[PDB]
Ligand binder design. Sequence first.
Ligand SMILES: NC(=O)c1ccc[n+]([C@@H]2O[C@H](COP(=O)([O-])OP(=O)(O)OC[C@H]3O[C@@H](n4cnc5c(N)ncnc54)[C@H](OP(=O)(O)O)[C@@H]3O)[C@@H](O)[C@H]2O)c1
Ligand SMILES: NC(=O)c1ccc[n+]([C@@H]2O[C@H](COP(=O)([O-])OP(=O)(O)OC[C@H]3O[C@@H](n4cnc5c(N)ncnc54)[C@H](OP(=O)(O)O)[C@@H]3O)[C@@H](O)[C@H]2O)c1
Ligand SMILES: O=C1c2c(O)cc(O)cc2O[C@H](c2ccc(O)c(O)c2)[C@H]1O
Ligand SMILES: O=C1c2c(O)cc(O)cc2O[C@H](c2ccc(O)c(O)c2)[C@H]1O
Lengths: 334, 334
Amino acid sequence: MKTACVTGGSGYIGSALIKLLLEKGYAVKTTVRNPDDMEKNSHLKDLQKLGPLTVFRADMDEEGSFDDAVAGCDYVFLVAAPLHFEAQDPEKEQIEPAIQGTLNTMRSCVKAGTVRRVILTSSVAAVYFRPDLLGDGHGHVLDEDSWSDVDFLRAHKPPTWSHCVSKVLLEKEAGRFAEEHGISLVTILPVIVVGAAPAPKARSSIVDCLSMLSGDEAGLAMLRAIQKTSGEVQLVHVDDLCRAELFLAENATANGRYICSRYHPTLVELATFLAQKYPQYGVKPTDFDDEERPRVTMSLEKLIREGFEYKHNTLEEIYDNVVEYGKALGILPY
Amino acid sequence: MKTACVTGGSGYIGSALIKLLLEKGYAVKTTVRNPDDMEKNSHLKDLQKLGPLTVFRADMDEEGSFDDAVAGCDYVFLVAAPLHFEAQDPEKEQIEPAIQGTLNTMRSCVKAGTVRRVILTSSVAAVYFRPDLLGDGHGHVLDEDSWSDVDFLRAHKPPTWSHCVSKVLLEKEAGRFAEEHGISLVTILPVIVVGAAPAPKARSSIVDCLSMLSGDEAGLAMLRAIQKTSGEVQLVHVDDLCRAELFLAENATANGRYICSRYHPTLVELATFLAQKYPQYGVKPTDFDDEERPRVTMSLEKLIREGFEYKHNTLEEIYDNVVEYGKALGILPY
Ligand SMILES: NC(=O)c1ccc[n+]([C@@H]2O[C@H](COP(=O)([O-])OP(=O)(O)OC[C@H]3O[C@@H](n4cnc5c(N)ncnc54)[C@H](OP(=O)(O)O)[C@@H]3O)[C@@H](O)[C@H]2O)c1
Ligand SMILES: NC(=O)c1ccc[n+]([C@@H]2O[C@H](COP(=O)([O-])OP(=O)(O)OC[C@H]3O[C@@H](n4cnc5c(N)ncnc54)[C@H](OP(=O)(O)O)[C@@H]3O)[C@@H](O)[C@H]2O)c1
Ligand SMILES: O=C1c2c(O)cc(O)cc2O[C@H](c2ccc(O)c(O)c2)[C@H]1O
Ligand SMILES: O=C1c2c(O)cc(O)cc2O[C@H](c2ccc(O)c(O)c2)[C@H]1O
C-alpha cells in the first residue's frame, strides 16, 4: 500500500485529489495551516471514512515544516500555492516566496528519502504568455515547449504579470533542484478547473466558471480577458485533473510537464449552454456575443499520446455537478 | 524498397497519396479507368519524375481488372469510390455496386499473396448518422465505435442517405472479407478534406471547402447542413490524411477503423478567417451567423494515442494552399 502526500488539503483541487487518492486505496498525508480549524477542514474528517488520512500543520513560508507530512511517502503532490494579489513589490512579496516555498517543500521530499515522484501543480499561466504569438494576429497551437515570457513580463509589467512569472520561475527552479538532487519531478499545467469537490470553503475557479450564473464581476472580467487574448477559454473537469495527476505519478515513463485541458468554448457557446440548462439564473447569451478572433489554443495531445483518458468530454459533462457545488458553497443564491 | 498500390490515381485523395508514397521512397502502382485520358491524368506523367510509378487500367465494376495493379504490392490503398448522385434505385445503382466494387479489389489482394495490409479510405459519413443522438439536445463526442444508422436511413431515406449506407455496408463487408481470408484491413474515416493535390480535374470536397469563396450553392448547402446537424464542421488537411494513411499501413499494431480530423470550426469562424485572409472574394461572415447548437463532434484520440502527429493544426495551416489549387482547377474564377 503506497503513501501519498497532498499539500494544502483545505483547498479546492487538493481536497478533490485527496478523495481520489483514498478511493484508489492510497494512504494519504495532507497539510493545512491550522488543523484545529474544523470549519475550514470539516471535509478532512468525512474523508477519513474512505481510508487512512493524516493531517499535518505546515506552511510553505516556514522552512522544514513539511518534513513530517512528506516522510514515508511514495508520492508528493505539490498543490498548495499562495493566492495572487497586486503587491507593491511582486518580486519580493510573491515571485521569490513562490520559488523559496516550492524549494522548501522540495527539500522535505529529498530529506524523506522515500519519494519516488513529485507531481507539481502549476498552470497554463506558465505556458501561454508569448508576446509574439499573442499579438501577431494569427492562430496558434501551444504545447509544453511554450513558456510564458518572463523577460517581457518583467520589462513591461502588465497587470498580474507576477503570477505568470512566479509559475515559470518556480517550475524552472524546482526542476533544476530535482535534477541536482536526483529526484523525479513531473509538472501538470491545468486550465480553468470545473466541478464539485469536498472542500467546504472553496472559491478559486469555482467563482470564475460560475460567474455567468452569479454575475460576479471579477469572474466575468477573467473570462472576457482570456477570450480577448486567446479567442476562447479552456476548461477541464476537476476529477479529470486529479486522475491526470495520479496518472503522472503512477506511470514511470511520464516525464517533464503536461498541459491538462479538455473543452475550449467561446464565451457565447458557454453562455448559451448555461442559459439553456440553468435558465433560472437569467443568463443572456447576447451579453457575450463577440467577433471571431484567431484561436490561440493549448494542445491536449501530450497526455493523450501517453495513454491518459478524459472522463468529462462534453461541455455538459464538464459542468455536470459544479452548480450544485456553487449552491452549497453560497457562491450561487439558490 | 516496398511497393504499394493506389486505386483511383486520377482522383483528389489518390493523387495526393501517390505523391506522398513516391516521396517516401515507395514504388507505386496506380489504377485509372482510361490511362490515355490526359485531361484527367496529365499529372501521372509529372509524378513519374518523383520515383517508380506505373499506371494500370482497371474498373471497380469490372471483376478482376485490379489483379495486375495489386500484384507484388506490400500495401494497397483503396481510395477509389463511386460518386454519389440521385438514382431512381440507389440500392442497385450506388449501394450494391459500392459493396461489390470493394470486394472486387479485395479479391485481387488475396490473389496477389504479397499484400501485408489494405488501407480503406472511408468517411465520417459512416460514423455520424446517429439519430438516437442528433435530436436529443445534448452534445456528443462520437468515436470509432459509432456507426451511421443503416436501418434508419433506409426507412426514412433523407437526402443522400445512400451515401452513408454505401460507406457503412462496404466497410462492414470488406472487414468480413478480410477476416475470412486472413488479410489485415484498416479503415480511415476523414472529415472534410482541404488542400492542394496533383489531380488536375478534382472536384469533390475542394468544391465544398471553397464554397464560401466561390458561392457554389451545393457546397454551401453541404456546409450549412453539417453545421445544423453537428453545430460545427470538421476539417483535415489532405496531406495529414495521406500521412495518416501511410502511418496506418506502416505501424504493425494499427487495427480497426480510425477517425481522421483536426480542426472543428463553426461556419462563422471559418468565414471570418477566409474573409480576412482572402478579401478578394467578398465573403460576408454575417451570412453564416447561427445560434450555438450542441456539439456533435468527432473524437481525435485514436490516431493520436497510437503515435500519429498532425502537421496542419491551425485553421490557417489547414487552408495553407487550397485557394491556389481551386484557382488552378477553375473552381474559383480568379
Ligand atoms: N482552480 C483552477 O482553475 C486552476 C487552474 C490552473 C492552475 N491551478 C493551480 O492549482 C493549485 C491549487 O489551485 P486551487 O484552485 O485548488 O486554489 P485554492 O483552493 O486556493 O488552494 C490553494 C491552497 O494553497 C494553500 N496555501 C496558500 N498559501 C500557503 C502557505 N503559505 N502554506 C501552505 N499552504 C498555503 C492554501 O491553504 P490556506 O487556506 O491555508 O491558505 C489553499 O488551500 C494552484 O497552484 C493553481 O495555481 C488552478
Ligand atoms: N474529399 C473529402 O472531403 C472526403 C471526406 C470524407 C471521405 N472521403 C473519402 O475519400 C474517397 C476519395 O474521395 P475524393 O475526394 O478523392 O473524390 P474523387 O476526386 O472524385 O476520387 C474518386 C476516384 O474514384 C474513381 N472511381 C469512381 N468509380 C470508379 C470505378 N467504378 N472504377 C474505378 N475507379 C472509379 C474515380 O475515377 P473517374 O474519375 O474516372 O470516375 C475517381 O478518380 C472517397 O471514397 C471519400 O468517400 C473524402
Ligand atoms: O492564464 C489563464 C488561462 C489562460 O491563459 C488560457 C485558458 O484557456 C485558461 C486559463 O485559466 C487560468 C485560470 C483562470 C481562473 C482561475 O481561478 C485559475 O486558477 C486559473 C488563467 O490564469
Ligand atoms: O457526412 C459528411 C460529413 C459530416 O457529416 C461531418 C463532417 O465533419 C464532414 C463530412 O464530410 C463528408 C464528405 C464530404 C465530401 C465528400 O466527397 C465525401 O465523400 C464525404 C460528408 O458526407
